[PDB]
Protein backbone atom coordinates (compact mmCIF):
# COMPACT_ATOMS: atom_id res chain seq x y z
CA UNK A 1 0.00 0.00 0.00
CA UNK A 2 2.37 2.70 -1.30
CA UNK A 3 0.76 6.01 -0.28
CA UNK A 4 1.27 9.06 -2.55
CA UNK A 5 3.07 10.78 0.37
CA UNK A 6 5.62 7.94 0.17
CA UNK A 7 5.50 7.46 -3.62
CA UNK A 8 6.89 11.02 -3.82
CA UNK A 9 9.52 10.48 -1.08
CA UNK A 10 11.01 7.38 -2.73
CA UNK A 11 10.98 9.12 -6.13
CA UNK A 12 12.96 12.02 -4.66
CA UNK A 13 15.52 9.50 -3.37
CA UNK A 14 15.80 7.35 -6.51
CA UNK A 15 16.30 10.43 -8.71
CA UNK A 16 19.04 11.66 -6.35
CA UNK A 17 20.44 8.11 -6.45
CA UNK A 18 21.03 8.67 -10.20
CA UNK A 19 21.55 12.47 -9.97
CA UNK A 20 24.81 12.79 -8.01
CA UNK A 21 27.07 11.03 -10.54
CA UNK A 22 30.54 9.49 -10.58
CA UNK A 23 32.34 10.63 -13.76
CA UNK A 24 33.06 8.01 -16.44
CA UNK A 25 36.56 9.36 -17.21
CA UNK A 26 37.54 8.68 -13.60
CA UNK A 27 35.99 5.20 -13.20
CA UNK A 28 37.44 4.21 -16.61
CA UNK A 29 40.80 4.13 -14.79
CA UNK A 30 39.66 0.87 -13.14
CA UNK A 31 39.89 -0.74 -16.60
CA UNK A 32 42.51 1.47 -18.27
CA UNK A 33 45.49 1.55 -15.90
CA UNK A 34 48.15 -1.06 -15.16
CA UNK A 35 47.59 -3.80 -12.59
CA UNK A 36 50.20 -3.54 -9.84
CA UNK A 37 49.86 -3.41 -6.05
CA UNK A 38 51.02 0.23 -6.18
CA UNK A 39 48.67 1.27 -9.00
CA UNK A 40 45.71 -0.75 -7.71
CA UNK A 41 45.88 1.23 -4.47
CA UNK A 42 46.29 4.66 -6.11
CA UNK A 43 43.22 3.88 -8.21
CA UNK A 44 41.07 2.58 -5.33
CA UNK A 45 41.92 5.73 -3.36
CA UNK A 46 40.93 7.90 -6.33
CA UNK A 47 37.60 6.07 -6.60
CA UNK A 48 36.91 6.48 -2.86
CA UNK A 49 37.51 10.26 -2.63
CA UNK A 50 35.39 10.88 -5.72
CA UNK A 51 32.70 8.72 -4.14
CA UNK A 52 32.92 10.55 -0.79
CA UNK A 53 31.92 13.70 -2.69
CA UNK A 54 29.10 11.88 -4.48
CA UNK A 55 27.83 10.67 -1.10
CA UNK A 56 27.98 14.21 0.34
CA UNK A 57 25.99 15.53 -2.64
CA UNK A 58 23.53 12.67 -2.13
CA UNK A 59 23.31 13.10 1.65
CA UNK A 60 22.67 16.83 1.18
CA UNK A 61 19.73 16.00 -1.11
CA UNK A 62 18.15 13.61 1.44
CA UNK A 63 14.82 15.00 2.77
CA UNK A 64 15.22 16.81 6.10
CA UNK A 65 19.03 16.64 6.17
CA UNK A 66 19.91 20.33 5.79
CA UNK A 67 17.44 21.18 8.58
CA UNK A 68 19.69 19.23 11.00
CA UNK A 69 22.32 20.64 13.35
CA UNK A 70 25.58 21.61 11.59
CA UNK A 71 27.67 19.76 14.24
CA UNK A 72 25.75 16.46 13.96
CA UNK A 73 25.79 16.62 10.13
CA UNK A 74 29.53 15.87 10.26
CA UNK A 75 29.18 13.03 12.80
CA UNK A 76 26.73 11.21 10.50
CA UNK A 77 28.77 11.67 7.30
CA UNK A 78 31.81 10.57 9.31
CA UNK A 79 30.08 7.53 10.83
CA UNK A 80 28.38 6.19 7.70
CA UNK A 81 31.24 6.98 5.28
CA UNK A 82 32.73 3.49 4.99
CA UNK A 83 29.36 1.73 5.32
CA UNK A 84 27.79 3.69 2.46
CA UNK A 85 30.89 3.01 0.36
CA UNK A 86 30.73 -0.69 1.22
CA UNK A 87 27.06 -0.68 0.23
CA UNK A 88 27.71 0.97 -3.16
CA UNK A 89 30.66 -1.31 -4.01
CA UNK A 90 28.44 -4.28 -3.13
CA UNK A 91 25.96 -3.03 -5.74
CA UNK A 92 28.85 -2.90 -8.25
CA UNK A 93 29.73 -6.58 -7.78
CA UNK A 94 26.19 -7.90 -7.32
CA UNK A 95 24.40 -6.10 -10.15
CA UNK A 96 27.55 -5.92 -12.34
CA UNK A 97 27.28 -2.18 -13.06
CA UNK A 98 29.21 -1.36 -16.27
CA UNK A 99 30.79 1.91 -15.05
CA UNK A 100 31.95 0.04 -11.90
CA UNK A 101 33.98 -2.60 -13.77
CA UNK A 102 33.33 -5.32 -11.17
CA UNK A 103 35.84 -7.96 -12.28
CA UNK A 104 38.73 -5.51 -12.63
CA UNK A 105 37.71 -3.57 -9.51
CA UNK A 106 37.92 -6.97 -7.77
CA UNK A 107 41.44 -7.56 -9.17
CA UNK A 108 42.62 -4.24 -7.74
CA UNK A 109 41.01 -4.77 -4.32
CA UNK A 110 42.49 -8.28 -4.12
CA UNK A 111 45.97 -6.85 -4.81
CA UNK A 112 46.25 -3.61 -2.83
CA UNK A 113 48.00 -4.52 0.43
CA UNK A 114 44.80 -5.76 2.13
CA UNK A 115 45.16 -8.81 4.39
CA UNK A 116 43.40 -12.13 3.77
CA UNK A 117 41.83 -11.61 7.21
CA UNK A 118 39.88 -8.63 5.74
CA UNK A 119 39.53 -9.85 2.13
CA UNK A 120 37.73 -13.12 2.98
CA UNK A 121 34.84 -11.61 4.99
CA UNK A 122 34.57 -8.56 2.73
CA UNK A 123 33.83 -10.78 -0.27
CA UNK A 124 31.81 -13.32 1.70
CA UNK A 125 29.58 -10.31 2.47
CA UNK A 126 29.39 -9.34 -1.21
CA UNK A 127 28.36 -12.89 -2.16
CA UNK A 128 25.62 -13.21 0.47
CA UNK A 129 24.12 -9.75 -0.06
CA UNK A 130 24.16 -10.53 -3.79
CA UNK A 131 21.99 -13.58 -3.19
CA UNK A 132 19.29 -11.30 -1.73
CA UNK A 133 18.59 -10.30 -5.37
CA UNK A 134 18.32 -6.69 -4.26
CA UNK A 135 16.74 -3.91 -6.36
CA UNK A 136 18.05 -0.37 -6.99
CA UNK A 137 15.31 0.84 -4.61
CA UNK A 138 16.45 -1.52 -1.86
CA UNK A 139 20.05 -0.38 -2.43
CA UNK A 140 19.16 3.32 -2.47
CA UNK A 141 16.89 3.06 0.57
CA UNK A 142 19.43 1.24 2.74
CA UNK A 143 21.96 3.94 1.89
CA UNK A 144 19.65 6.70 3.15
CA UNK A 145 19.03 4.51 6.22
CA UNK A 146 22.72 3.83 7.02
CA UNK A 147 23.58 7.54 6.70
CA UNK A 148 20.82 8.59 9.10
CA UNK A 149 21.48 5.94 11.79
CA UNK A 150 20.92 7.65 15.18
CA UNK A 151 23.24 5.33 17.15
CA UNK A 152 26.47 6.78 15.72
CA UNK A 153 29.23 7.83 18.10
CA UNK A 154 29.58 11.49 19.20
CA UNK A 155 25.93 12.41 18.50
CA UNK A 156 23.80 14.66 20.74
CA UNK A 157 20.34 14.96 19.13
CA UNK A 158 19.58 11.31 18.27
CA UNK A 159 15.79 11.79 18.51
CA UNK A 160 15.90 14.22 15.56
CA UNK A 161 17.82 11.59 13.57
CA UNK A 162 15.32 8.88 14.61
CA UNK A 163 12.60 11.13 13.15
CA UNK A 164 14.41 11.09 9.77
CA UNK A 165 15.16 7.34 9.61
CA UNK A 166 11.72 6.03 10.68
CA UNK A 167 10.11 7.48 7.48
CA UNK A 168 12.50 5.48 5.28
CA UNK A 169 12.26 2.25 7.28
CA UNK A 170 8.46 2.35 7.00
CA UNK A 171 8.64 2.80 3.22
CA UNK A 172 11.16 -0.06 2.90
CA UNK A 173 9.01 -2.56 4.83
CA UNK A 174 6.12 -1.63 2.52
CA UNK A 175 8.25 -2.55 -0.51
CA UNK A 176 9.29 -5.85 1.12
CA UNK A 177 5.60 -6.79 1.39
CA UNK A 178 4.61 -5.40 -2.03
CA UNK A 179 7.31 -6.99 -4.18
CA UNK A 180 8.09 -9.86 -1.76
CA UNK A 181 4.80 -11.23 -0.37
CA UNK A 182 6.13 -14.81 -0.67
CA UNK A 183 8.63 -14.11 2.14
CA UNK A 184 7.59 -11.72 4.97
CA UNK A 185 11.10 -12.03 6.48
CA UNK A 186 12.59 -9.93 3.64
CA UNK A 187 12.52 -6.63 5.55
CA UNK A 188 14.47 -8.41 8.31
CA UNK A 189 17.09 -9.60 5.80
CA UNK A 190 17.75 -6.02 4.68
CA UNK A 191 18.09 -4.88 8.31
CA UNK A 192 20.41 -7.83 9.00
CA UNK A 193 23.01 -6.28 6.71
CA UNK A 194 22.95 -2.97 8.61
CA UNK A 195 24.52 -5.05 11.40
CA UNK A 196 26.89 -6.84 8.98
CA UNK A 197 28.09 -3.46 7.64
CA UNK A 198 28.93 -2.34 11.19
CA UNK A 199 31.38 -5.22 11.64
CA UNK A 200 33.28 -4.02 8.54
CA UNK A 201 33.65 -0.55 10.05
CA UNK A 202 35.88 -2.14 12.70
CA UNK A 203 37.71 -4.09 9.98
CA UNK A 204 38.31 -0.84 8.10
CA UNK A 205 40.14 0.92 10.95
CA UNK A 206 42.68 -1.92 10.97
CA UNK A 207 42.89 -1.87 7.16
CA UNK A 208 43.81 1.82 7.13
CA UNK A 209 46.44 1.24 9.83
CA UNK A 210 48.15 -1.43 7.67
CA UNK A 211 48.40 0.90 4.67
CA UNK A 212 49.71 3.78 6.80
CA UNK A 213 52.59 1.79 8.32
CA UNK A 214 53.44 0.76 4.73
CA UNK A 215 53.50 4.39 3.53
CA UNK A 216 50.26 4.91 1.63
CA UNK A 217 49.10 8.51 1.34
CA UNK A 218 45.31 8.86 1.27
CA UNK A 219 43.64 12.25 0.59
CA UNK A 220 42.74 15.27 2.71
CA UNK A 221 39.02 14.48 2.22
CA UNK A 222 39.30 10.80 3.19
CA UNK A 223 41.75 11.60 5.99
CA UNK A 224 39.08 13.97 7.34
CA UNK A 225 36.07 11.64 6.92
CA UNK A 226 37.91 8.71 8.59
CA UNK A 227 40.35 10.62 10.86
CA UNK A 228 43.93 10.05 9.66
CA UNK A 229 46.76 12.10 11.23
Amino acid sequence: ELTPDQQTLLHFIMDSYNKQRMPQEITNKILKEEFSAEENFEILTEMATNHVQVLVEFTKKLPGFQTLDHEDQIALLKGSAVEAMFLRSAEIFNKKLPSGHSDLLEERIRNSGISDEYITPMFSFYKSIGELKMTQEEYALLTAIVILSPDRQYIKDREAVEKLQEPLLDVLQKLCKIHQPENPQHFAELLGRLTELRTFNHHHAEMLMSWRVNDHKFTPLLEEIWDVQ
Binding site: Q53, V56, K60, Q66, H70, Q73, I74, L77, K78, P220, L221, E224, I225
Partner: peptide, 11 residues
Protein backbone atom coordinates in the same frame (compact mmCIF):
# COMPACT_ATOMS: atom_id res chain seq x y z
CA UNK B 1 38.13 21.46 12.78
CA UNK B 2 36.91 19.39 9.79
CA UNK B 3 36.90 22.17 7.21
CA UNK B 4 36.40 20.15 4.01
CA UNK B 5 33.16 18.43 5.02
CA UNK B 6 31.68 21.71 6.31
CA UNK B 7 32.82 23.27 3.02
CA UNK B 8 31.23 20.50 0.91
CA UNK B 9 27.85 21.00 2.62
CA UNK B 10 27.85 24.82 2.32
CA UNK B 11 29.05 24.76 -1.31
Amino acid sequence: DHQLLRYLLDK
